[model samples]
Target chain A: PQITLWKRPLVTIKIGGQLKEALLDTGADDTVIEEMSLPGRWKPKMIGGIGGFIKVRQYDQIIIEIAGHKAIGTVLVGPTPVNIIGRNLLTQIGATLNF
Target chain B: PQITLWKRPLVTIKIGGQLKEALLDTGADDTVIEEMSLPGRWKPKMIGGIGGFIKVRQYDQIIIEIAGHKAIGTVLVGPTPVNIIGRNLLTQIGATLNF
Candidate 1:
């Protein structure tokens, strides 16, 4: 099933909870994840009011398959609420956004 | 494939772009989808500046397979970038937030 492929040299990834699609933008400096997509049960556990620097939450480890490629990584549930696809994701995948 | 199932009534959904985990809140009235989860390529096409109601854009129609339960539907990429999984998803799936 070829969902729309990107003409732009970027790949959108839907990670975290149940993201179907996401834009991979290298122009953007940070790896932004949408805050609202977070599941209700994991909200409090993943995102807290603050007190720690790295807001690390438990992700049950989902397998992502893209471009006939698959990778496994830990999904970090962010504390703050916002939608952003940042550098962290690019760095993790060892892929950079072109143009 | 059996991922970790939810023990509590609430199931967090990460919509819009790439959300690992998002909380399902019935308290939220609108069927809020994450504005950020949208793929960069699809953003402009899906979300317009404004002037129209029922912010309807193009959804790639992703079939989500969960717990042996699969549903086919179009994923509407939102305009404003934010993380939100709302009522439409719950209603479409015929499931409640349970919290």
Candidate 2:
């Protein structure tokens, strides 16, 4: 079965000499970069949302943009290779979301 | 005094016909939107970080873009009108920030 890829705003970043597609979730929490597959220097924090509170291990600290507002935060590292844009940096500037 | 608006990506969305600046934070925890100022249906959730743990309330659900990938999540409301891109939604898709 073929999966239909949803078109959203995408950008390219060079990490360890690799480029990948990451979904920008304006509703997400932090700029999470996968430092490693397992937990390490970065500790895990519990996030409570519609899915309930989830424990996420901390990872790399990176600066990112959504729409293009640059924000700095400690992003939690996950097992995957995707990057996220979370709430902490959004409300700082007055903006909205689009479909 | 002249304040320089950081050259970031900004998009226009129709929310009561108001256009504002919203920043994307990949380090935040959930989706946040502002409903009212006094605090009613939306209660505050405490988020701990380097600065300190701050309490924010839950608000409306909206879809947004970072580098343009879509993931939906609940947004926490703030006093201002900007939308936040958080971590909860980033790891779901692989994306990152370009410095």
Candidate 3:
């Protein structure tokens, strides 16, 4: 499916058995979601974005369903205004940028 | 061109008659560049991203060429880790996300 950039490239993702809307962000290197709890302990981490670096919790080997495509990778939990499905998981779903 | 998520989707942008590398960002609402001087007056503004908000100088109707496609719109200049070509300019180039 081709998703135009006329609007926010928001897509539904299932994580921790819950559905959430997240942005399909090619500019980000890691997938980041609003702070939430999951099954296991995560490592303290930090990530950089347009704004700057922010402290986050990294939950690796997590299963996430992006737009109905199942993906397994690292998910960062942090204080983000919105959830972003970055390249780390986008590759698992074979998402690409086209012009 | 189809850009895979295996690497950073960096593209060349012509700004201020010079070439620059920028990310194709679907998550960002507006185009942002690292601090640089441009012609004419601009307004001070604050924009929010993954971490938080940052003060920037907004230059309107600035001419920018993304991947050889020309676009005219507001451009924000501030302290960013890297330059990002957001949806505002991506739409001009007809860039889209596909799965």
Candidate 4:
């Protein structure tokens, strides 16, 4: 499937058995989500971006579906203002940028 | 050219007669740059994103070169931590997302 760049490249994603909207951010290195409850053991981690560094729970082996494409990877649950699907998960779904 | 989803899809852009690297951010709605001096008149504006809202100087008719393609559009200069190329500029370069 092809994703068009409108105002923001937003897409639907399913994580932890729930559906949510996330921004496809190639600018980010790791996928970050709004802090949510997940039943699993996670390590405390920090991620930096345009604003600053924020603390997050690095949940490993999380299954996520992006536009019907299934992918398993690390999911960072934090106080991120936006749900961002970064390179970590994008690569799993074979996303590419072209001009 | 095709851009691979690496850690971050970083690209070099020429703006205001200077060259700088920026993140290709589909999550952002408008192009934003780290505080820089740009010629021409601009208006004060605000943009909201992941973290919060920021004040920016919106410069119109700004010439920007991305991947050797020339585009003239609005450019926002602000206290952005990272230089970000958003939809406004990406569309001009015929950028597309595929999976």
lDDT of 1 by residue, A1-99 (tens): 211111222344545435444443322333334443443233223232112133444443444433334445334444334333333333445442111
DockQ of each: 0.02, 0.05, 0.83, 0.65
* Candidate 4 residue B32 C-alpha distance from true site, Å: 1.1
Over B1-99, each residue of candidate 4 has an lDDT whose tens digit, in order, gives: 778996578889999889999888787778999999999899999886544567899999999998688988899999887799989888888898899
What pairs collide in candidate 3?
none
lDDT of 3 by residue, B8-86 (tens): 9998999999899998888888999998878899999998876678899999999999988889998999988889988
Q: What's candidate 4's DockQ score?
A: 0.65
Could you give candidate 2's per-residue lDDT for residues B1-99 as a string of tens digits?
Answer: 111123333433333334444444433455444453422355557655332345677644444443445554445655333454454554444433332
Q: Give the lDDT of residue B67 in candidate 2.
A: 45
Ten-residue segment with the worst summed lDDT in candidate 1 chain A?
Answer: A1-10
| CAPRI-style docking class of model 2 based on DockQ | incorrect
Candidate 1 docking DockQ: 0.02
lDDT for predicted candidate 2 compared with the true structure: 0.44
Error of 3 at A18 (Å): 0.7
lDDT of 4 by residue, A1-99 (tens): 677786678889998889999988887788899978876899988776555566788999999998889999999988777799989999999999999
How well does candidate 3 score on lDDT at residue B62?
97
- Candidate with top lDDT is 3
lDDT of 4 at B60: 95
List where candidate 4 sits over 4 angstroms from the true fold. none
Which portions of model 1 show Cα errors greater than 4 Å? A1-99, B1-19, B25-56, B65-69, B79-82, B97-99
Cα TM-score per model: 0.26, 0.34, 0.96, 0.92
lDDT of 4: 0.86
Instruction: Please identify model 2 stretches exceeding 4 Å from their true place.
Output: A1-6, A15-18, A34-40, A63-72, A79-82, A87-99, B1-99
